[PDB]
Amino acid sequence: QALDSARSLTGQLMQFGSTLLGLIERRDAEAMSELLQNQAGELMLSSLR
Amino acid sequence: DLLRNGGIDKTNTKTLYTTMAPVITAAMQLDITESGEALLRWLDNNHPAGILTTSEARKLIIKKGQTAGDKEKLAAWCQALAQRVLVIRTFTLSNAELQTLSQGAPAGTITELYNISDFHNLINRCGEQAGTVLDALQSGTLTVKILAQALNLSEEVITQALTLAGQKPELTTWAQLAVLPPRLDLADTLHITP
């Protein structure tokens, strides 16, 4: 029964780990997508220039 | 609020950083929680006077009722944090450079932002092998052989560039590496050895 209680918490820890990896990679996706846009802006500046 | 609730940041050191750093990084939009762990250490090691050590910041965030005073003190602490993040972001120094500078790189006047930029320059020169340079510098085994192999120059140029304001045999601190880039650039712009 101690084993089952720990196995339940380890399953929940795995769920946290999956969600955390998802959020990490998703935040890094948003940061890149914003970097690309900032670059496109400071590049259209030279294009207009 | 996110620091006040949640798990009480543990009193023992080297855990205060690791327990405060994820949310600190989230508030500073740093790259890595480990860069956040190192930024607090850096601002702890050298800071403008009157700004709270991270221990005092924890003891002040966990208080019964945060007074009118000792809350602008915490605002000043977080402003110092933001200023340090700015120093990191204007030089775009990597997590490893950050971790090297965390153990006492004075910053806050131009005479010292210069040496920060010089160190950063030397590390960017090291390039794909800067991990090894900064690791052997974090330990006590940074030798001119590995530094030259990393910079793709000879030992017989670096042991000479050290001699100007000489600290030749013991490469122990990052401050000794910020001396290189000026001497190297000079001995490159005049085709001579240092």
């Binding site: 101690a2 795995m14 780990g17 | -």
Partner: protein, 49 residues
Amino acid sequence: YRFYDLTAARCMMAEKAYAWQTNDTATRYIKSGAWQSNNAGLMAGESLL
């Protein structure tokens, strides 16, 4: 991070209940290295489980 703290304690409780229900204390199964700071502790649940 502060959930892995509970999970490792549960796995240790389970190991102790194992050692007390079977008198084999020399052996140990819940081993360290489940949390690696290189990976911000990701896949701690996998190792623990």
